[model samples]
Structures are given as structure tokens and as C-alpha cells.
Target: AISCGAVTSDLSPCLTYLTGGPGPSPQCCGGVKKLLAAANTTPDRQAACNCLKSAAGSITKLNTNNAAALPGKCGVNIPYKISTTTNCNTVKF
Candidate 1:
């Protein structure tokens, strides 16, 4: 089962970018791809969604635009937009 601890660790590299850094580094994208690759099931996706929502809440100076754009910037396609308001229960695929 996916856990918030794992999710946070996987995406830790993205903090710099999400907190208004110029852009996501290759390592950040690597983490994004890794997390997405692991989130291959609905349950996993929902867990990831919830984890991200909680994580986003705690980050200081997180750029919402950057958060929303991260997946696309990494050339990854997620089922839902990365946002605190995203309903995790609805995340599919």
C-alpha cells in the first residue's frame, strides 16, 4: 500500500521547484516519473493524491501554478490535476 511517507520522499526533490524555483530539475522529474510509474492502480493513485494534498498544505511558498504544471512539465499525464482541492476519491487510472 502507498503511504504518505513514501510519497513525500519520492517527491522531495520537487520542493525546490514547487517553492518557486526556476524549474523542475532532472532529479525532480525523475521522482515524478518514478511516483507515477508506481501509481499504476486506482488505490495507488488515490493514495498519491491524498498524500500530495497533505504535503502541499505544509509547504511554505509553494507556487500553485508550478504544482499544477509539474506533471506536464515532466511530460507525464496524471488522471487529475495536482491540487489541494482535487478530490482524491475520483482519481482513476
Candidate 2:
């Protein structure tokens, strides 16, 4: 799917405590863009971004770490199969 871990890994350890893990910020999103490159198309990729939005907002606004509570705009079930376990939940995003 949309693998943000790639870019975020480059600059996470220094920022995770700042925005909290799995909780994205403007900088997190900025790093996300490094991997996204494009804006639209694949469902899986979009799902990841959407998931990131809710995550960043939740962590920044609500201050919760329950990633399972986040929405599934990302990690969508493309075509017919479901891409259920994404990093957000699998890794306790």
C-alpha cells in the first residue's frame, strides 16, 4: 500500500516524540510526500494518505494512540480483496 515508513524513517526518531508515533504532522506529511511523489490513482496509496490525515489530526487534536480507532480511508480493499493490516494498525500507528 502507501508505505510512508520509507521517508518517515529518515526523520522519525527526531520527531516521533514531538508529534507522537503514527501521529503525522506537517513535517510528517512533508516526508510522506517524498514517497507519494504523485497525488492520485491507486486506492491503496490514497488509503495510506487518508489514514495519515486522520492519524495526524487525532494525535495532534485528541492526543490518543489508539490507531485501531483511526479511519480506513487508507489501506482500502482494492478491486475485491481487502488490505486489512496496514502499518497504522499492525505497528500500533
Candidate 3:
């Protein structure tokens, strides 16, 4: 859950693509869903946690909360906007 501050305008855009939504942007879910699926797994959580940390400038950080990954190595579908909620969101890793 996002237990910290708000997100920036640019941040949302990046999340949009990660979600898998069509059009100019994707949704954040596409990126963070992995963590939720394996929320109890150490390696999975760590991997997702690290990825979200690197996106500090705009997304969540483990220190405060969670955010989406910057973008995977290959075949990463970039987004243009994303959603952040107490439930699920890539921007909330």
C-alpha cells in the first residue's frame, strides 16, 4: 500500500503503459500485479521492491511506500498515465 506522499504528473504517465491499457497509455497494474500475486515470496517481493525504489523521483519507495517498476529490460510496454490507490496500482508497487 502507498503509505506516503502523492505522485507527480510525469509519474502517472509512466505507469499508464505498465498497466497494459491500450491507447496513449497503459495501466499501472501490469507492472505491480506480480508483487501482489507473490506478495509472500521473498525473492519476488524483493525484486519488485527494488524496481519500485529505483523509480523514486516520481513513484513509490519502499522506505515510505511502494511504486511501479521503471520498466523491464525488454518488451516493456510503457504507459502515459496510472492510478494509485490503497488497493492495487503499479505506481504503488
Candidate 4:
């Protein structure tokens, strides 16, 4: 199974920004890059998306709008909101 733990660790630095904080930190962007690097397969990408979506809801006071922009802000190329209701199966890895 794909572990969300790594996703959490990779994105830990983004907590401040995700939870109503300011813009992303350098570390947050770095982590994004690392996370992208780690996600190699369609399954891995799906798992990552689901994990992030789950986190978006579970995290207290998360600014989902900002969360959605994370990929763009960090120069990652994902084009969707990270919401719990997103259909991971249809997401293109």
C-alpha cells in the first residue's frame, strides 16, 4: 500500500501555510518537489492525491483554497482542488 505517512512528512513544512498561515515556505516547495519525485506510478499518484485530499479535510483550519494552489505555487502541475470528494480513480497520474 502507498503510505500517506511519507506524504505527511514531505508536506509537514506546508502546515503553517495550509492552516491559515502565509505563503509557502521554501521547505514546503522543496518537499513538494520531493513528493513529486517519489510518486512514480499511476497508483502512486492516485494514492498521493487521495492522501492529500484526506489531509485537506482532516487538518484543522486548513485553507483549502491555498491548499489547492500548492502545486502551482510550488511549480507542480496539478490542476484540481484537493478535496475529499475528488475522484482519485479518474485523476491522471
Candidate 5:
């Protein structure tokens, strides 16, 4: 099972960049790095994607395009697209 909002909160720093704010800050990248390190398995990745997907869906001003760009901007390689339409179940190891 996944930790409640910990994962989502760990990624909360990205909200600035992900919500159409300017560039990604070092703090944002730091959080992203930690998040990546935590999700070290298929289930974790899927869970993270699902949690993030839910969070993303709830953001009325969510910039899906910007959210998807965070990984690259933060120099991380995420295998799945950060979109509501993305299938979280497909997130693999």
C-alpha cells in the first residue's frame, strides 16, 4: 500500500512549475529526485502515477503540458506522461 499524501506532498514543490509558473526551481528538482528514488518498483511507480494523476485532476488550473515538462526540466527521465489520460496502470519498473 502507498503512504497517504506523502508521495504527493513530496512532489508538491513542483506545483509552481507544473501549474504554469516559470522555470523549475532547485527545490522542485530536489523533491523530484527524492520522489524518483522512492518509487523504485513497478507498484510504486503505478501508485505514484495514480496519486499524481488524482492530484492533477483536482487542480482546476493544472497545466498538463507544464506538468509533463517538469521531469525533463528537472533532468529526470519519467517513463510515463503526466496526464489525466495517461494510464497509471501501465507505469512499469
Candidate 6:
């Protein structure tokens, strides 16, 4: 199981962009890419999904548009959407 702490660290760089920064920083895209690489299995992907969902819930200023566009901006195709409503259990490669 991927730890929430690890997920948090991996995604921390994206917060600025998700909360209205000019755009995702290089580090932010790097983090997104790294996360995708790390979450290689079904369970890992689900865990990452749940972590992101939880993180999103806690961030009052998160921009849904930015969140939705992040993976594409980073040129990564994740198995699940980055949203609170995403069903982690259904996320599979």
C-alpha cells in the first residue's frame, strides 16, 4: 500500500498550480510524472487515487479545472481522474 505521506510529498509540487499559480512548475510536472511511474500497480494506483481524493477534499482553494488538466499538461495518462468523486476502487491500468 502506498502511504499517504508518500503520496502527499509526490503531489505537493502540484498544489501551487492547482490553487491558481500561473501554471504547473517544472517540479510540479516532474512530480506528476514521478507519481505515475511509482503507481504502477492496480493497488498502488487506487491508493494514490484515494490519497489525492482526500487531499483534494482538504484543499478549499483547489481549482477543479487545473486538477482535471494536470495529467494532460504533464503528458501523463493516469488511470483515474484527480477528483474527490473518483472511485478509487475502480481505478485500474
Best by lDDT: 1
Question: Which stretch of 10 consecutive residues in model 5 shows the poorest summed lDDT?
Answer: 1-10
Model 5 per-residue lDDT tens digits across residues 1-93: 556486677567777677777768788888777766787777777776777777778766777677767778789968777777789686555
lDDT of 6 by residue, 17-90 (tens): 77777666787788778766887788777777778888878777666778878877778766567777778787
Writing each residue's lDDT as its tens digit, candidate 4 over 1-93 gives 457887897667887778767767888888877766787777777788777777767678666578767768888856456666777778564
Model 5 collision count:
0
For every candidate in turn, the CA RMSD to the true structure comes to 1.7, 10.1, 11.7, 2.1, 1.9, 1.7
Off by over 4 Å in 6: none
On residues 1-93, what C-alpha lDDT tens digit does candidate 1 reach at each position? Answer: 777777887568888888877677888888888777887788887787788888888778666678878878888867677666778786544
**What's the alpha carbon RMSD for model 4?**
2.1
Give the C-alpha lDDT of model 2: 0.39
Q: What digit string (tens of lDDT, one per residue) describes model 2 on residues 8-73?
A: 452353246334455444554445444445434555456555445434453453333333222122
- Tell me how far candidate 6 lies from the true structure as C-alpha RMSD in angstroms: 1.7
User: What is the C-alpha lDDT profile of model 3 across 1-93, one tens digit per residue?
Assistant: 322122223335545443333322344444344333444444444444444444443433222211223333223423322223221233333
Query: What TM-score does structure 2 among the candidates reach?
Result: 0.30
Candidate 4 — worst ten consecutive residues by lDDT sum?
77-86
- Superposed by TM-score, candidate 5 places the C-alpha of residue 16 at a distance from the truth, in angstroms, of 1.4
Looking at model 5, the pairs that clash are none
lDDT-wise, the better of 1 and 4 is 1
Q: What is the lDDT of candidate 6?
A: 0.75
Stretches of model 5 off by over 4 angstroms after superposition: none
Q: What is the C-alpha lDDT of each candidate?
A: 0.77, 0.39, 0.36, 0.74, 0.73, 0.75
Of 1 and 5, which scores higher on TM-score? 1
Model 1 misplaced regions, further than 4 Å = none
Ranking by lDDT: 1, 6, 4, 5, 2, 3
TM-score of each model, in listed order? 0.84, 0.30, 0.30, 0.79, 0.81, 0.84
